[PDB]
Amino acid sequence: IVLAQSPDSLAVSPGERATIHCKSSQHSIAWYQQRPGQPPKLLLYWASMRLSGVPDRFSGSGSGTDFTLTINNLQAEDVAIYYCHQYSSHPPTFGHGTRVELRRTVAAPSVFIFPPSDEQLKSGTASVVCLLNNFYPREAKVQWKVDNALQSGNSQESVTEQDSKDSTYSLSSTLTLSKADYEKHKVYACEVTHQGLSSPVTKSFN
Amino acid sequence: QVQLVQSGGGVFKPGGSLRLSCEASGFTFTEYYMTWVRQAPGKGLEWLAYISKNGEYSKYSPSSNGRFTISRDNAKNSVFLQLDRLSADDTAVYYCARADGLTYFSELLQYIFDLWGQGARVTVSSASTKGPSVFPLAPSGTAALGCLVKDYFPEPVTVSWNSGALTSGVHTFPAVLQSSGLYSLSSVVTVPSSSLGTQTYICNVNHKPSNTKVDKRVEP
Amino acid sequence: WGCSGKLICTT
């Protein structure tokens, strides 16, 4: 008994309507809200019955196998992950959730490149950092190249929560090499692709 | 006020065991089956266990294999979760949750989790406490500079800039667990290029678990 | 049959 929940992510403007789906392989459905760094909170059970205190803009529906959570007049406090829960199966299961983010105009990342400090090289490792600042939507990709040679499996990424101020995201890519591998190379560059870009941006150094 | 307050989280060596606690107030405790639910970093919710009203009957997820024990102390309005033979896969946030549902004899049925504790963070690593190393990310319109906070254990560190006097356009990233078993993140901030040689930028890194604070001046 | 709480039972 699985719960395919969709979409995985969902961008919505404030005042507008958010629509989350939940389908099972086989009305005992509950919906939960979890804001960043917060515990889950029950909103609806029996698919359509709101818990006391939950605002009227939250409504649930669902015929048999497909279930819907609807958020009208979207508020800022509504940005969270939403989980559907089937409680008539054994054991009970949850969907993997649906992220509800705010919608804004497309923004291109201001890309910066950061050479490893001389202070770090003394330790024996070299961290090259690429920064993608204040962009939208969240989807973006970053390629590392050293002497024009593509790198992979040696760079960790990390991205911020949606910005409270301007609804943008930021991303960091950290390329880690040994001191040996860093001193035997010259030109370092990260290449960024994104919707707000008409062509892949490159920042580099020697 | 109707609430569940948890405690007992922390960092643990593998192979051992831990007990988590949850204290209920504002409602009649013996009228509810209590449960534990956990959430692994990134993953979803996983129901672990439920315990009956009188604290005598408990049921577990099929994947528990006896490692988990839920228990309760009604005189203290408390539920507990013990977890033996800890491994890294046990690293997660653990929630205490109240269950509303049907019972059939001792079996809990048709249940929803209508009240939740604030959660307890559990980290299991063979790693030892280590303060962070802090390396500058030196800058070249507007400029960008930052701090690389590397090789610390455990989480968290907090980063502030200029003793917390600089907040505008600061972005501190989520920590990532390196293969070495240590954590690492960056904190960047974008400022006017003109104020580079007129304003000094120091990032401040606080690491409570090791009782340390590191300041790093950042210049081009 | 019995109840844990009341929501599920009384709906």
Cα distances (angstroms) measured from residue B75 to each of A149, A205, B116: 67, 67, 20
Fold annotation for B127-220 = Immunoglobulin-like (2.60.40)
Size of interface A-B (CB pairs under 8 A): 101
Query: Residue B168: what are its φ and ψ, rounded to 5°?
Result: -65, 120
- Residues of A near C (Cβ–Cβ under 8 Å) read 45-46, 49, 51
Q: Name every chain B residue with its beta carbon within 8 A of the beta carbon of C6.
A: 100
Cα distances (angstroms) measured from residue A138 to each of A158, A164, B140, B207: 12, 14, 26, 30
Are residues B135 and A120, on separate chains, in Cβ contact within 8 Å? yes
Helix (H) or strand (E) holding A67: strand A66-71
CA B156 to chain centre: 9
- Per DSSP bridges, beta strands B10-12 and B120-124 are parallel
**Structural determination approach:** X-ray
Determine the distance in angstroms separating the CA of A45 from the nearest CA of chain C, rounded to an integer. 9
Give CATH for domain B1-126.
2.60.40.10
Give the residue ranges of DSSP H helices in A91-169.
118-121
Q: Name every chain B residue with its beta carbon within 8 A of the beta carbon of A158.
A: 173-176, 185-186
**CA separation for the pair B89, B125 (Å, rounded):** 10
Give the residue ranges of DSSP H helices in A42-189.
118-121, 179-183
Do the beta carbons of residue A180 and residue A159 sit within 8 Å?
no
Sequence-distant (≥ 6) Cβ neighbours of residue A95 within 8 angstroms = A3, A4, A5, A22, A83, A84, A85, B44
Q: Name every chain C residue with its beta carbon within 8 A of the beta carbon of B51.
A: none
Residue B189 burial class via C-beta count within 10 angstroms: exposed 0-12, middle 13-18, buried 19 and up: buried
Q: Is the dihedral of CA B184, B196, B199, A161 positive or negative?
A: negative
ω into residue B136 within 30 of 0, thus cis?
A: no
Sequence-distant (≥ 6) Cβ neighbours of residue B93 within 8 angstroms = B38, B39, B41, B119, B120, B121, B122
Domain with CATH 2.60.40.10 in chain B: 1-126, 127-220
Where do the domains of chain A lie, and which CATH numbers do they carry?
Answer: 1-103 (2.60.40.10), 104-206 (2.60.40.10)
**CA separation for the pair B80, B55 (Å, rounded):** 11
Q: Name every chain A residue with its beta carbon within 8 A of the beta carbon of C8.
A: 45
Gap sites in chain A (C to N > 2.5 Å), preceding residue numbers: 26
Helix (H) or strand (E) holding B57: none
Show the tokens assigned to B23: 């204290």
Show the tokens assigned to B192: 């006017």
- Per DSSP bridges, beta strands A125-135 and A141-146 are unpaired
**CA separation for the pair A45, A85 (Å, rounded):** 9
Are residues B174 and A158, on separate chains, in Cβ contact within 8 Å? yes
How many other CB atoms are found less than 10 A from the CB of residue C2? 12
Are residues A129 and B118, on separate chains, in Cβ contact within 8 Å? no
Show the tokens assigned to B122: 């559990």
The beta-carbon neighbor of B103 closest among C2, C6, C7 is C2
Determine the distance in angstroms separating the CA of A7 from the nearest CA of chain C, rounded to an integer. 29
How many other CB atoms are found less than 10 A from the CB of residue A139? 11
Q: Name every chain A residue with its beta carbon within 8 A of the beta carbon of B191.
A: none
- Per DSSP bridges, beta strands A9-12 and A98-102 are parallel
β-sheet bridge partners, residue A101: A11
The total number of residues shown for chain B amounts to 220
Helix (H) or strand (E) holding B78: strand B78-83
Show the tokens assigned to B161: 């800039």
Residue matched to tokens 């090791």: B210
Residue B124 burial class via C-beta count within 10 angstroms: exposed 0-12, middle 13-18, buried 19 and up: buried
Determine the distance in angstroms separating the CA of B184 from the nearest CA of chain C, rounded to an integer. 45
Q: Name every chain B residue with its beta carbon within 8 A of the beta carbon of A39.
A: 95, 116-119
**CA separation for the pair A195, A168 (Å, rounded):** 13
Cα distances (angstroms) measured from residue A53 to each of A44, A155, A179, B202: 11, 46, 58, 46
Sequence-distant (≥ 6) Cβ neighbours of residue A90 within 8 angstroms = none
Give the residue from B2, B4, B27, B103 with the most C CB atoms within 10 Å of its CB, the best one to mutate: B103
Indicate the SS3 state at residue B108.
Answer: strand
**CA separation for the pair A147, B175 (Å, rounded):** 29
Q: Is B40 on the interface with A (CB under 8 A)?
A: no
**CA separation for the pair A132, A113 (Å, rounded):** 9
Determine the distance in angstroms separating the CA of A69 from the nearest CA of chain C, rounded to an integer. 20
**CA separation for the pair A33, A203 (Å, rounded):** 40
**CA separation for the pair A141, A157 (Å, rounded):** 10
**CA separation for the pair B29, B32 (Å, rounded):** 6
**CA separation for the pair B167, A15 (Å, rounded):** 29
By C-alpha distance, which of B169, B176, B172 is closest to B206? B172
Do the beta carbons of residue A167 and residue A190 sit within 8 Å?
no
